[PDB]
């Protein structure tokens, strides 16, 4: 019963940029409520019109600030204020990136691997990140692992990619535990080739 929910371009957005949040469904709604959860949660309203087959509202968000970052869900209704909200939509995590110094990202043992074999990608920095996030280009979610700190002073997390199937261009971001939705600059993109 849930509207569809989509970020454009995506859910990872640089500071001071703008993004579009789109809610749409088979059902024709005439009223969408965009809800961001958490501290300073907020609900935004848009009188989306469907044109036929589909109903849609496009929410504008930004310029991107730490306070518009967090988890969003869209709700459809039919009556006017004060609505009767349909099922939630799949949450989306609006992450504000390019905000701290980019981590280093590196492949072990190498960026090229035989099918079925494991690769581990390591996220590193001397900055004191509590968490790291691994992005494969073209995906909408990112793995996260807690940064453990090494005697040498390096903050690091190691993501095993599992049995190599297809390649991917990988990026990673650091974040601090008080601000889970606020991320560093992306690391330099690493390209894994499977053989």
UniProtKB/Swiss-Prot annotation:
The GO cellular component terms are: plasma membrane
Biological process annotations from GO = immune response-regulating signaling pathway
Q: Extracellular side: which ranges?
A: 1-195
Disulfide bond keyword on record: yes
Q: What does this protein do?
A: Receptor on natural killer (NK) cells for HLA-C alleles. Does not inhibit the activity of NK cells.
Quaternary structure per UniProt?
Interacts with HLA-F; this interaction is direct.
Q: What is this protein called?
A: Killer cell immunoglobulin-like receptor 2DS4
Organism name: Homo sapiens (Human)
**Which gene is the coding source of this polypeptide chain?**
KIR2DS4
